[PDB]
Amino acid sequence: ASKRALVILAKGAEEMETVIPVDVMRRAGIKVTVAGLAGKDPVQCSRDVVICPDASLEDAKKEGPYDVVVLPGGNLGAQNLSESAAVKEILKEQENRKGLIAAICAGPTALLAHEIGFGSKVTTHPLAKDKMMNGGHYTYSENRVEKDGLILTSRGPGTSFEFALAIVEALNGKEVAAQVKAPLVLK
Amino acid sequence: ASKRALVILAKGAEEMETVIPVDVMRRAGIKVTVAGLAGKDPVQCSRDVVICPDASLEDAKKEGPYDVVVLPGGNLGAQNLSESAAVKEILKEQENRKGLIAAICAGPTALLAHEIGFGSKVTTHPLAKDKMMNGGHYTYSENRVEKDGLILTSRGPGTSFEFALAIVEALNGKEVAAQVKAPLVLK
Ligand SMILES: *[C@@]1(=O)C(=O)N([C]C(=O)O[C][C][C][C])C2=[C][C]=[C][C]=C21
Ligand SMILES: *[C@@]1(=O)C(=O)N([C]C(=O)O[C][C][C][C])C2=[C][C]=[C][C]=C21
Ligand SMILES: [Cl-]
Ligand SMILES: [Cl-]
């Protein structure tokens, strides 16, 4: 059976960190739902790219649960995810069921806000380290991608392919990830 | 004065190759117009990401000319660009005025279709080489980014950051490109 991914898309999301994982996961045969935090309407990303979500979060939640929940970064995107009770509920449920949660750039700061994965080794964008580490609830890593059990984090737009391929590997295995990687012309 | 970029967005465009250059160019202070080939409506990209263009191509053309014209790849995107009389006119004008033209993945095959930049050293996605080289009108390169004068080409999603930063360097210089690069967390 096909794996399923929920990508939560908020105003101010970093559009590269949203699109690269969506695209790469689809290349891997994952069924991906791009879910609008605010509803079903188009979302203005951080650099003004406008993306039309597949569904509202409210609706995508009804079709849960998912094999992965993905949190893009972007400062204002991650803040919107951090402030959302709906995101809180989704992440708590995911953690409780031992499902994967993946977050990139400032995205992992939503894990802090929602008290998810405490004690994990994590990375973030360098600029988001201090926010993530407030209280010493995680251990910090400078690895480009950090997978600690079911908490998978990464650093920035430039690590988005690596992040996405790590998700693919976690869900579908090493061999699928390698097959998906080759046509991309990655260094 | 600020440089201006026209990114031509067709149905079936590779969304990573569209979004990474748009975002990176905006980070560089370039004024970017995402122009819908078919009109003003949202565009279904290759992996089903839906992007709302800033304008129709018809309208963006009236605000021309541009310091760069950018052609994303995607097989079906590049075919739509290749078949477009409007794209032909835009590229011929750009070439005649000695403005930069940048194309990635299958995107450079539109240069062939429109008889642009013949004699240039170019690259493409490996799978698009034979189409690009039909007639021996270009010389082929395996470099991740190839800049030959005002024809700038690149290979795939995994070379999109390098492609975008090369555009930035061409328009705004080495130092701006380096400054834009550092926060991205690129290898
Ligand atoms: C990331 O895409 C991203 O999310 N940020 C935001 C950030 O780190 O802000 C720190 C503020 C505390 C949350 C960012 C910054 C720079 C380049 C890329 C990215
Ligand atoms: C590119 O994004 C892309 O454009 N292609 C299409 C391609 O090369 O098709 C060749 C058919 C002749 C035009 C592609 C293919 C695979 C991965 C990435 C990309
Ligand atoms: Cl941001
Ligand atoms: Cl394609």
Swiss-Prot record, chains A, B:
Gene name tied to this protein: PARK7
Record keywords, A-Z: Acetylation, Autophagy, Cell membrane, Chaperone, Copper, Cytoplasm, Disease variant, DNA damage, DNA repair, Endoplasmic reticulum, Fertilization, Hydrolase, Inflammatory response, Isopeptide bond, Lipoprotein, Membrane, Mitochondrion, Neurodegeneration, Nucleus, Oxidation, Palmitate, Parkinson disease, Parkinsonism, Phosphoprotein, Protease, RNA-binding, Stress response, Tumor suppressor, Ubl conjugation, Zymogen
Effect upon mutating E17N: Strongly decreases enzymatic activity
UniProt lineage: Eukaryota, Metazoa, Chordata, Craniata, Vertebrata
Entry protein name: Parkinson disease protein 7
A matching Pfam family: DJ-1_PfpI
Localization per record: Cell membrane; Cytoplasm; Nucleus; Membrane raft
Position of the Glycyl lysine isopeptide (Lys-Gly) (interchain with G-Cter in SUMO) cross-link: K129
GO process annotations (BP): adult locomotory behavior; androgen receptor signaling pathway; autophagy; cellular detoxification of aldehyde; cellular detoxification of methylglyoxal; cellular response to glyoxal; cellular response to hydrogen peroxide; cellular response to oxidative stress
Tissue specificity of this protein: Highly expressed in pancreas, kidney, skeletal muscle, liver, testis and heart. Detected at slightly lower levels in placenta and brain (at protein level). Detected in astrocytes, Sertoli cells, spermatogonia, spermatids and spermatozoa. Expressed by pancreatic islets at higher levels than surrounding exocrine tissues.
Function recorded in the entry: Multifunctional protein with controversial molecular function which plays an important role in cell protection against oxidative stress and cell death acting as oxidative stress sensor and redox-sensitive chaperone and protease. It is involved in neuroprotective mechanisms like the stabilization of NFE2L2 and PINK1 proteins, male fertility as a positive regulator of androgen signaling pathway as well as cell growth and transformation through, for instance, the modulation of NF-kappa-B signaling pathway.
Residues where lipid is bound covalently (S-palmitoyl cysteine): C45, C52, C105
E.C. number(s) listed in UniProt: 3.1.2.-, 3.5.1.-, 3.5.1.124
